[PDB]
Design a binder for this molecule. Structure first.
Ligand SMILES: C[S@@+](CC[C@H](N)C(=O)[O-])C[C@H]1O[C@@H](n2cnc3c(N)ncnc32)[C@H](O)[C@@H]1O
Ligand SMILES: C[S@@+](CC[C@H](N)C(=O)[O-])C[C@H]1O[C@@H](n2cnc3c(N)ncnc32)[C@H](O)[C@@H]1O
Ligand SMILES: C[S@@+](CC[C@H](N)C(=O)[O-])C[C@H]1O[C@@H](n2cnc3c(N)ncnc32)[C@H](O)[C@@H]1O
Lengths: 269, 281, 265
């Protein structure tokens, strides 16, 4: 796969697309939870050579626009994109579940604590500008889930559904990794899946990003000590806890703070 | 057959069961009590077979007599499981649940009517009197009705730990069976649906009714839900579903609801009760 | 068929309880996997006393599989050929090798870390993964690591029994719910009253008694301690701390018990 194809403006999407390539979707039927404006669908179809891509989104206008972008960005593969229409939260319509049940791989880069602070505004404008062009939501809470203790409730809710509807399907998801890979792997093991980390990158966190959640979390987990994972350099050589990274920023407003993003595949037994 | 407008929670449950499509099915009810729902499911719903159990060991025998009177024709077709059965936690109960197409229940939950235990007490001793026994006041279950072991459940945070506990058991023991449960909906329909989705079931709301909550009902539990933080310690949006009118047109938060009763202690406050069927994939 | 009293561990009442439950479990002729093999004594016990057909297992520390192998060979030479440990640093069963073995096992067994374990077990002299299991619903009673194992055993070996050793200060209703919440029908195979080491911290259990329910909201809950060794006189966790306060050397007891979780099935 060539370098040009991975999103060059958003490291999270880039991390997610380099992992989808490594996942090996060629000839498979894939389902994307949260297609948005379909750029990832175009990528999976044109670059990963997926046989069939379906998907849905919470906002029901996006399916229309995803199709449009796919026709424009992957015209020779566009006929293989069959979105599920409607306002679909996770996979919660009969239509969505039917297609999920027929999928080999379910993929998603889903809301989570630690996501870029501007991702919602971005997503919203993105819609509009395409929704002709040529406010919700509402991004739910999923507070009941055990792994919402580390900000991953929505991702756990999806795994509960995937296991039930498509028990033999892989599930490939993108994650901020400040809580560490043991926690990330536990999310999958708790829910019937063997995790494999397909890919990871050190990414720059936007200036002014609030990391108070991660500082509080690592205070709560000490008894060996648990520490959140941040980095002081883009090579990820200088390690920092949430507390040290916040301390750095308290001093120098312009301090560069880095963290990992990584794609993990869950595979059932 | 009258519905008894005195007990809207039960009326909602039974209307839901009628809609669940139990005809020719084999049903297990968790918490049979004196068997009124059993008789309803046999006589009105036309279930092929009904079984069930109760935490109070004295109720299966009493329920057995009672359905005989209530539904003399099809009073067999009812085979209760004996003993003090919590949820379905005996080998006889599990064996019957494994053979059932549908498990139904109107189970203890935060937000249940405050007079629910007194009503069950009175219903049992009424039943024992119709059966011809002049008994002592031994128609009340004592400690057990435990809550502690259900406290760890994710959905215990919204008062439904016991219901989630049941879903863990029904999925394992009868992976193909529907589970049809009655709920007070003060915590919201979306939360009630997540209870099923989180545990392997696709929920469908069979029936719902707006019901008036008793004047002295404390609702600070639901107010606290609206002020609590997420598990993350970050602020959370959470709005409970109350209403101001018996048609359910005026919506009210728990905070809003508690304001009115602070203003006018006599104010009427309503909420939804709904029957939700969980269906496995 | 004499009771093999000689064979049970005389040194550790927790291990003694485990082994007594393991003989009651009926492992004869079966394929058994032990999480946390340690030195291998339990394996030797299961081979030589329980007549397991085959035994495998793993430990978090990769230098212990070899040591276990050594002691199984020295303690059960004529059965040690039935021991096939999984090498490597294996947390729970989280390698492909471990997983393949578990999937072929009739029974998974373990005496796993948990809040309330003796303070000295940690020391070796021969946890540590822990934070990742903080989110489990039963970590509220200090059993999150055990809950994590039950999530894996159900998925990897949905037909296998799981036999686990437990301190029962939180009481048997809670211990049984850990299994019922996770797809297993529990059965208490064996239990004993043990003496907790003078000076053991039970702040955790006192906190459980003074806690508002998750709701929450009132919660009436009492831990199970004992004042004697026959478990005749009951004590709450608060009452037990109170005594340790009155006496530095007050003797405090609690139950240890072995529970088998059987899928249903
Ligand atoms: C902006 S992305 C999530 C952020 C993530 N950190 C990232 O960079 O990819 C959100 C997309 O997923 C969709 N989405 C959000 N919540 C969803 C849900 N619960 N179910 C399905 N789609 C959802 C949104 O409509 C939007 O198209
Ligand atoms: C307690 S009521 C609840 C009724 C429901 N809230 C309503 O308002 O209509 C239902 C029956 O369940 C029984 N019950 C209570 N706890 C139980 C448990 N853990 N397992 C089984 N049955 C139980 C009670 O004896 C009673 O007979
Ligand atoms: C802490 S000791 C057992 C504590 C237990 N409560 C007791 O009283 O015996 C755990 C044994 O299992 C192993 N072990 C500890 N944590 C483990 C883990 N996360 N996965 C697999 N084995 C583990 C250790 O090497 C040790 O051999």
């Amino acid at each position: 796969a060539p370098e040009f194809a991975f999103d060059p403006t958003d490291p999270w999407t880039e991390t997610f697309q380099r992992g989808l390539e490594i996942a090996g979707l060629g000839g498979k039927r894939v389902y994307e939870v949260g297609i948005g404006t379909g750029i990832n669908v175009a990528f999976m179809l044109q670059i990963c050579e997926a046989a069939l891509v379906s998907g849905s989104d919470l906002d029901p206008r996006l399916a229309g626009l995803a199709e449009r972008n796919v026709r424009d960005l992957a015209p020779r593969r566009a006929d293989r994109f069959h979105p599920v229409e409607g306002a679909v939260s996770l996979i919660d319509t009969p239509e969505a579940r039917a297609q999920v049940g027929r999928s080999d791989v379910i993929v998603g880069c889903l809301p989570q604590v630690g996501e870029p602070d501007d991702v919602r505004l971005r997503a919203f404008r993105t819609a509009q500008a395409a929704a002709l062009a040529a406010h919700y939501y509402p991004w739910a809470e999923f507070d009941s889930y055990p792994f919402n203790s580390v900000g991953l409730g929505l991702n756990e809710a999806l795994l509960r559904r995937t296991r039930a509807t498509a028990p033999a399907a892989d599930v490939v998801l993108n994650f901020g990794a400040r809580v560490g890979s043991a926690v990330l792997f536990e999310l999958f093991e708790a829910n019937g899946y063997v995790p494999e980390k397909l890919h990871s990158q050190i990414v720059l966190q936007h200036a002014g990003t609030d990391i108070s959640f991660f500082v509080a979390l690592e205070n709560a987990l000490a008894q060996r000590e648990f520490t959140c994972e941040f980095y002081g350099d883009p090579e990820g050589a200088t390690r920092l806890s949430a507390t040290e990274a916040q301390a750095l920023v308290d001093t120098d407003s312009a301090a560069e703070i880095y963290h990992e993003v990584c794609v993990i595949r869950g595979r059932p037994a």
